[PDB]
Amino acid sequence: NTPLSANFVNENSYAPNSLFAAILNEDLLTGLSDKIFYGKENEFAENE
Amino acid sequence: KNNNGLFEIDTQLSNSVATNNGGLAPSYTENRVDAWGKVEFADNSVLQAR
């Protein structure tokens, strides 16, 4: 029910294994900046 | 300025609005697209031509 929640991920599929269709925010797709900036919040832990 | 749901600073419009010269409202300049846009009048020779 809330985003970014899934602490467990296994591995990624060989081929498409789902149907999919979606409604998009055409405004937000127009409004978003050209360059995405990630940071240290998306890095793996530097030591154990 | 709202851009498709996300507000971003507009530095030219900020400077345009902030240039009030101590008055209550932004300056008008004839040769500049300022907070009041830009207005060019037709020459008076438009009345004869039309």
- Chain B CB within 8 Å of residue A30 CB: yes
Name the resolution in angstroms: 11.0
Cα torsion through B37, B38, B44, B46, rounded to 10:
-80
Residues of B in Cβ contact (< 8 Å) with A31: 3-6
Q: Are B34 and B40 in contact (CB under 8 A)?
A: no
SS (H, E, C) chain B: CEECCEECCCHHHHHHHHCCCCCCCCCCCCCCCECCECCCCCCCCHHHHC
Contact criterion met (CB < 8 Å) for B5 and A30: no
